[PDB]
Amino acid sequence: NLCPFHEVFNATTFASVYAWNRTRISNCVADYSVLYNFAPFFAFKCYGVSPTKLNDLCFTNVYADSFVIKGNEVSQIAPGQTGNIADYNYKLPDDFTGCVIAWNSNKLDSKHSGNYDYWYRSLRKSKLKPFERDISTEIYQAGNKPCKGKGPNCYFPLQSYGFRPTYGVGHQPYRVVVLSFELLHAPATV
Amino acid sequence: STIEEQAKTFLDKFNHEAEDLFYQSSLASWNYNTNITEENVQNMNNAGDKWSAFLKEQSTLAQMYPLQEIQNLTVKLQLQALQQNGSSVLSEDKSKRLNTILNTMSTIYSTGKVCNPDNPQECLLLEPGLNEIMANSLDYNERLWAWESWRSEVGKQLRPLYEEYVVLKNEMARANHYEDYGDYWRGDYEVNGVDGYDYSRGQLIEDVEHTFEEIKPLYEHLHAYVRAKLMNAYPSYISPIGCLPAHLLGDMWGRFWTNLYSLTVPFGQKPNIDVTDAMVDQAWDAQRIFKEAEKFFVSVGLPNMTQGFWENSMLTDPGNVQKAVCHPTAWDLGKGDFRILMCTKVTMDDFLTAHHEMGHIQYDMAYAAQPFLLRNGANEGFHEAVGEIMSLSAATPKHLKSIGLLSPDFQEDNETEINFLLKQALTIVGTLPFTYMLEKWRWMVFKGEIPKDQWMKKWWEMKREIVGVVEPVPHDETYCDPASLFHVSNDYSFIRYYTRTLYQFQFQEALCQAAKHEGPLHKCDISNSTEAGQKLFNMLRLGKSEPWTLALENVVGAKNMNVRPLLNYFEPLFTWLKDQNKNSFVGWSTDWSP
Ligand SMILES: *[C@@H]1O[C@H](CO)[C@@H](O)[C@H](O)[C@H]1NC(C)=O
Ligand SMILES: *[C@@H]1O[C@H](CO)[C@@H](O)[C@H](O)[C@H]1NC(C)=O
């Protein structure tokens, strides 16, 4: 058969960065021509595996994440990076083996009046360990007084993404699909 | 958590919300500027309203972090910029009265009209008719009549409003932990907190006075030459002792001497160079001028320009349909959106203005990486200095020959150099004493050395001793002659232009020094020189993070205002003027009266 790689790149909508979506693509025959056939990619990196040597490699689990970020925040999707995304939203392990694919999507993620349906986390008590999800909207207390609600020294942790078609190039939406390759002692199915 | 940490996580939320609300306000203003419609006046107004509300709630929440415990310089600067009480420190009724008086001032100045002579239908407005009749005129009577009529129609109806406005603004400034309104305006050129680079308002006054004292010889020689030239064309009207009439000087207020070239040309046989015919012969459209400007900027070393600058910004007049305004402005919406609003044609003026606005655009792209409250020039004369140095570099004959607007067989002579130097001097060095005198008068009026009942006689005295122009007719104290200027009636500062010229000449000298140029300074060119571009960008990227005394030092090697580069620029003209007016008298005596 064929791997469900098409339904990941061809999704009608993409989840937010602070709440990304992970799908396991085990138990299928890898093709990779679907990912090689899509639109030109603003970025295409793979650490650990050669792009061409992907056909003969046998793996047991292939994960596929999906989110939407800005243009100048794409460079933070890499092992050993510091920023607002790599600390609180999405972190990759220092030992990584997979490909990172991104492509500009301005025609689909711009409402000309504020596409406030995309959110990211800017305030957190501690950094995020690799491959962790944190979906919470509890008030963040930055002062020395207990917080009874929104007000002085009490902020909403999330921050909205406002996307417009007239923005620059670093403030435009970019859909990112990373492909983490996991190798285990169990027999390989991919 | 300490106070520096609370300040830091409060200043990040401000930054995000503010960039969004400013983009919406600015896109609303562009849509109004590019297309005038009541819906557009309506939306400009609603978005401005939401921005002002945010700013005030955040400056009322930003008052809980004292500056005595903040150590970081950038955080302290942002908090200081966000903690200003402003006009809100006044009472509600007083604030409303001040706003109404400012609004009525703007309305009377904008819609002021003189129609007394002949039938009332003979109505002449300022911009269409008065400026046109003042730019070119050969009759004494009409110029004197226009001057007196405008001065009366302004002062007679504007003096009490100016008195009330002065009193209210002085009270507000005193309540704002200052000395007067002049001190409030002078607080911009202030550095405090870093050792080695410190400044004060009195230091600024002393520096301005010292620079004017150093520069006075050149202006005296230029004034003597101008008076000698005007004697022949306008006989039996100017005494040789000096003090040319204020009205008989070109511009309505005599801010510039640009339109005096037709009467003060050194050599009429050799005309100044022009490339309008060259541009129109090669079918140069509005796109090619900006393409060539971008090519020059990228040849210097600065980066290219985004596509959104090409698709979004408009560069040509949209015709009778969809009327707009033609004022060349470099728009910076903030979220990676840079646009230019201007209608261009085949003219040298547009060719230079393209580079002038592209300089501001490059500055904006350079400092766009700074936080929201630190995205500005170090002073108010830093943007214009960059614009004018790029314009100066783009107008050299060598550059014009290189780009292709002039024949390669063309040759330059000393007569053309003298003509160009005099053209530059009539605009740059001819507007410094007027600015200095006006700013000094405003400072003394605001602070209190000037009696309330003595406002016009001392103004004319200072104009006589400093600028060197007398009143054509006596004026009683009821008049409010200074208020006729656009800047004073609309609450604007004026020292910015003096500071801008003094900074721009230093910047040009320092930049073309590093390009390995040998010869006169006025022929310096920066094309095809990456070192100068890198040196300029090093200060461009700073923004307002560092004090101006350090940004200035990073480029020219000096941390203060200097006038030596300005005198070096006009050295051949100074020598020629010294050689010229050796038979005529030099200087003026204020004893002349009508
Ligand atoms: C998905 O695939 C279809 C056809 O395979 C194509 O028309 C479409 O542009 C792709 N992308 C989206 C977002 O639907
Ligand atoms: C996202 O992940 C969920 C499980 O977390 C899965 O059920 C779903 O199919 C994925 N895709 C979309 C578009 O929701």
Residue numbers in the entry:
A (entry chain B): 334 to 482, 484 to 524
B (entry chain A): 19 to 612
From the primary publication:
KP.2 and KP.3 carry new F456L/R346T and F456L/Q493E mutations on the viral receptor-binding domain (RBD) of the Spike glycoprotein compared to JN.1, respectively. Mutations observed in these lineages, especially F456L and Q493E, are located on the interface between RBD and human ACE2 (hACE2) and are shown to affect the receptor-binding affinity and substantially escape the Class 1 neutralizing antibodies (NAbs). RBD with ACE2, particularly the synergistic effects of F456L and Q493E, we constructed recombinant subunit proteins of JN.1 + Q493E, KP.2 (JN.1 + R346T + F456L) and KP.3 (JN.1 + F456L + Q493E) RBD and determined the variants’ structures in complex with hACE2 at a resolution of 3.30 Å, 3.30 Å, and 3.29 Å, respectively, using Cryo-EM. Consistent with previous reports on earlier SARS-CoV-2 variants, the interacting residues of the three RBDs with hACE2 are comparable, including Y449, N487, Y489, R498, and T500.
